[PDB]
Symmetry: C2
Subunit: 138 residues, 2 copies
């Protein structure tokens, strides 16, 4: 809808930064749409990813990093606070030791920093969603 998808925005992050996203899946959960949010070290899409957050709606979440072009140790969660057919509000906050992922106001996932968040230069939001809000607290 309102924002282009894939959505790419330059960004700087440190402890206390929050990335807030509002959007809606493009398909019912039965069709397993995805959402992905990638925290990149450079503006190019092929650059390393300090934190990749990938939702398969109704099924699972996987998180990982891509370092020197290589995907690293995948982490999986079956927590699924997202609601079929509904708009969601997603908040990713930078804590001292990890990212905190809030969904609709509830803590839902965490991911320990593998690389300092100060390495981030770009955030990309893509896959099977419409996007109405993207904000980085500065």
């Amino acid at each position: 809808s309102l924002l282009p998808v894939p959505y790419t925005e330059a960004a700087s992050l440190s402890t206390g930064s929050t990335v807030t996203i509002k959007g809606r899946p493009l398909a019912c959960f039965l069709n397993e749409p995805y959402l992905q949010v990638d925290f990149h070290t450079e503006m190019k899409e092929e650059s390393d990813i300090v934190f990749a957050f990938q939702v398969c709606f109704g099924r699972r979440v996987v998180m990982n990093s891509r370092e020197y072009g290589a995907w690293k140790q995948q982490v999986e969660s079956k927590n699924m606070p997202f609601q079929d057919g509904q708009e969601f509000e997603l908040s990713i906050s930078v804590l001292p030791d990890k990212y905190q992922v809030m969904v609709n106001g509830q803590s839902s996932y965490t991911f320990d920093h593998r690389i300092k968040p100060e390495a981030v230069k770009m955030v990309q939001v893509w896959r099977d969603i419409s996007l109405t809000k993207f904000n980085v607290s500065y």
Copy 2:
């Protein structure tokens, strides 16, 4: 680009029908964009799927059916004729006993009919691609 994505078109299929698609992934293969083509029994996206063809570009292809709302036995192929960053031409032909998937003019995947192709009423093409051509031979 030219066609909306997700792209949904009513369709009737029988032996000798061909569905031809031209498109391009929205991201480099390192980012694992998807392409999916679903042959549905009704116009609604939640209806059963006689043949679901899902490409994870650079990684794998999985194929399945969704019958009475339940995904069935998944089939996987690591054949990857798609080229990183390039437009592709995909042809799905209905043979008497199976679907034949051509990629850029080469036979690449097959999938035996689990349900008669005459059950199809709709084709949907979606996930991380731009779409410039969609044609059903009639």
